[PDB]
Amino acid sequence: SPEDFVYQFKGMCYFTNGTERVRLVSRSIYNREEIVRFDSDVGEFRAVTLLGLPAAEYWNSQKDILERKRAAVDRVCRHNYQLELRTTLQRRVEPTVTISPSNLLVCSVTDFYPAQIKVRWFRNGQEETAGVVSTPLIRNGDWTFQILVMLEMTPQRGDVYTCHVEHPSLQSPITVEWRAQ
């Protein structure tokens, strides 16, 4: 196994309620260890580990660097959110909803964006709270998601199972019905 030395720099922006709270955290990382950090809430470089202390002290002593970092939350995070509002945040892809047996009944919700979604199981009109096991939200990497929500079922005559899906792309919820065959 050959040797490798890795350095990462992440200029990270955190948004809550649109632009109500905007926070910048730039992280300097040696291998997998964050060593220095500039948190806009804090206002100055902070050493995470001993390896980053000389860097944090030096950058903090430079007035022009501190001035640029303190404006970065506006010149980067706020500035770019305007571009996201016109691009990524307009993206709406409606989910595909299917039910199939696996005793487990699987409601499959695929190829949707954004990630915000609510899925619920119903049996003969009654919402099933227990026996509902759900996979984590699966990131496909192509700006779509999928999720699988299972229901522990007992095949009993004409039990009517219904998957109910709500998503920001849908004006009305999607309801898909499955009956045992």
Partner: T-cell receptor, first 108, second 112 residues
């Protein structure tokens, strides 16, 4: 040992004398250092920051030595109003530790 | 200046107490400390923009919150005689500052 250690027993100093406070910290990654002053049954008040070059402000001098991990506070020409408990305060990553302090009693 | 209410309190064992702290105008970080006789300052928690930022070693019955005006409250659920202390709040302009401005404290005595 404690993370921040200060001179224990009370300092009884005659008015006009110079007094030296000492403090040591264990975490070598500690980034910032401060001295606070606290009256009996009252709240702490920020006195000064500590710098390697030696922050000087009137009768007060605060110095840092990272090689030995020592923090010092010097008060020249002490007055009766200097009588208080002096807290050594050390800032590390997501940790701000207040020492238990060194009580100073200035005598006329 | 930092305002702390109430300044003095008497409570009986098993009761609950709520203390309030208004920071300096402009300051957005509020931290709570306990000063027990013969102990030294003990960190409870710090709040910045309504969310708890860091927390000390106190049990769950010690809780806090910060409102949208930066004002902060802390609560102790089931008081014990050993909880008697001076409870201090401190504010600063930015989060995780080593330069704190303390209020005058809420002096709480828990009684039989």
């Amino acid at each position: 040992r404690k993370e921040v250690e200060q001179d224990p027993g009370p300092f009884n100093v005659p008015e006009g004398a110079t007094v030296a406070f000492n403090c040591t910290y264990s975490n070598s990654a500690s980034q910032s250092f401060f001295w606070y002053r606290q009256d009996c049954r009252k709240e702490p008040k920020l006195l000064m920051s500590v710098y390697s070059s030696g922050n000087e402000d009137g009768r007060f001098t605060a110095q840092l030595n990272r090689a030995s991990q020592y923090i010092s506070l010097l008060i020249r020409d002490s007055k009766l109003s200097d009588s208080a408990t002096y807290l050594c305060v050390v800032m590390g990553f997501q940790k701000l530790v207040f020492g238990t302090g060194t009580r100073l009693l200035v005598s006329p | 200046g930092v305002t702390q209410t109430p300044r003095y309190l008497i409570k009986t064992r098993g009761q609950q107490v709520t203390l309030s702290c208004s920071p300096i105008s402009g300051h957005r970080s509020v931290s709570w400390y306990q000063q027990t006789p013969g102990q030294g300052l003990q960190f409870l928690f710090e709040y910045f923009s309504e969310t708890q930022r860091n927390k000390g070693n106190f049990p769950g019955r010690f809780s806090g919150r910060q409102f949208s005006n930066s004002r902060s409250e802390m609560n102790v659920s089931t008081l014990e005689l050993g909880d008697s202390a001076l409870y201090l709040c401190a504010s600063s302009l930015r989060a995780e500052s080593g330069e704190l401005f303390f209020g005058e404290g809420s002096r709480l005595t828990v009684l039989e």
